[PDB]
Design a protein around this motif. Sequence first.
Motif, mmCIF file in Angstrom:
data_model
loop_
_atom_site.group_PDB
_atom_site.id
_atom_site.type_symbol
_atom_site.label_atom_id
_atom_site.label_comp_id
_atom_site.label_asym_id
_atom_site.label_seq_id
_atom_site.Cartn_x
_atom_site.Cartn_y
_atom_site.Cartn_z
ATOM 1 N N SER A 33 -6.271 -4.176 4.966
ATOM 2 C CA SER A 33 -6.773 -3.519 3.765
ATOM 3 C C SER A 33 -5.862 -2.371 3.339
ATOM 4 O O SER A 33 -5.929 -1.292 3.918
ATOM 5 C CB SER A 33 -8.173 -3.014 3.980
ATOM 6 N N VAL A 38 -3.864 6.218 4.113
ATOM 7 C CA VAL A 38 -5.070 6.948 3.750
ATOM 8 C C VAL A 38 -6.022 7.161 4.913
ATOM 9 O O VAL A 38 -6.708 8.180 4.965
ATOM 10 C CB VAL A 38 -5.776 6.238 2.602
ATOM 11 N N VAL A 39 -6.090 6.254 5.838
ATOM 12 C CA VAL A 39 -7.050 6.391 6.912
ATOM 13 C C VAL A 39 -6.551 7.446 7.876
ATOM 14 O O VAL A 39 -5.349 7.622 8.051
ATOM 15 C CB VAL A 39 -7.271 5.047 7.599
ATOM 16 N N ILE A 40 -7.438 8.197 8.425
ATOM 17 C CA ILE A 40 -7.057 9.251 9.348
ATOM 18 C C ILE A 40 -7.122 8.760 10.779
ATOM 19 O O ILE A 40 -8.069 8.086 11.175
ATOM 20 C CB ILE A 40 -7.962 10.464 9.158
ATOM 21 N N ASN B 22 -14.039 -0.873 6.458
ATOM 22 C CA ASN B 22 -12.935 -0.188 5.827
ATOM 23 C C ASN B 22 -13.411 0.709 4.718
ATOM 24 O O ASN B 22 -12.836 1.772 4.494
ATOM 25 C CB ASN B 22 -11.918 -1.179 5.342
ATOM 26 N N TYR B 25 -13.588 4.223 6.082
ATOM 27 C CA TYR B 25 -12.386 4.968 6.365
ATOM 28 C C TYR B 25 -11.665 5.383 5.127
ATOM 29 O O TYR B 25 -10.882 6.316 5.175
ATOM 30 C CB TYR B 25 -11.481 4.161 7.231
ATOM 31 N N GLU B 26 -11.930 4.761 4.023
ATOM 32 C CA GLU B 26 -11.204 5.160 2.852
ATOM 33 C C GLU B 26 -11.894 6.236 2.068
ATOM 34 O O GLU B 26 -11.323 6.745 1.111
ATOM 35 C CB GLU B 26 -10.982 3.956 2.001
ATOM 36 N N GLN B 28 -13.807 8.755 3.753
ATOM 37 C CA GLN B 28 -14.375 9.659 4.722
ATOM 38 C C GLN B 28 -14.617 11.022 4.116
ATOM 39 O O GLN B 28 -15.720 11.562 4.210
ATOM 40 C CB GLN B 28 -13.465 9.724 5.919
#
Lengths: 56, 50
Positions: A33, A38-40, B22, B25-26, B28
């Motif tokens: 995805s 962007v994900v931490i 997902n 996580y995008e 958060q």
Amino acid sequence: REGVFVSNGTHWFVTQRNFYEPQIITTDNTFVSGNCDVVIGIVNNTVYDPLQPELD
Amino acid sequence: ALQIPFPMQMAYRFNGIGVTQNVLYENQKLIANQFNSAIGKIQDSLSSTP
């Protein structure tokens, strides 16, 4: 897809949540995805695809 | 009791309602902000509610 990315100190695996049964991370049990900024807390690793070694 | 990072716990719950993880996580940061504001309005509501 289901389970958790678990690392044992040096290697990363995927495992179902309620019982330790590590497996190799492959393209079949993971889904993609978007780009990876962007994900931490994301980490880096090889995701093997079983189709490359066959080289049909 | 097994410890687990809190964002992953909430991702689990998202799957619980049929939304792919997902999605958490995008967003958060945004989700956290909404939650904080709601908790803040709770106290005012209890005090203002007669």
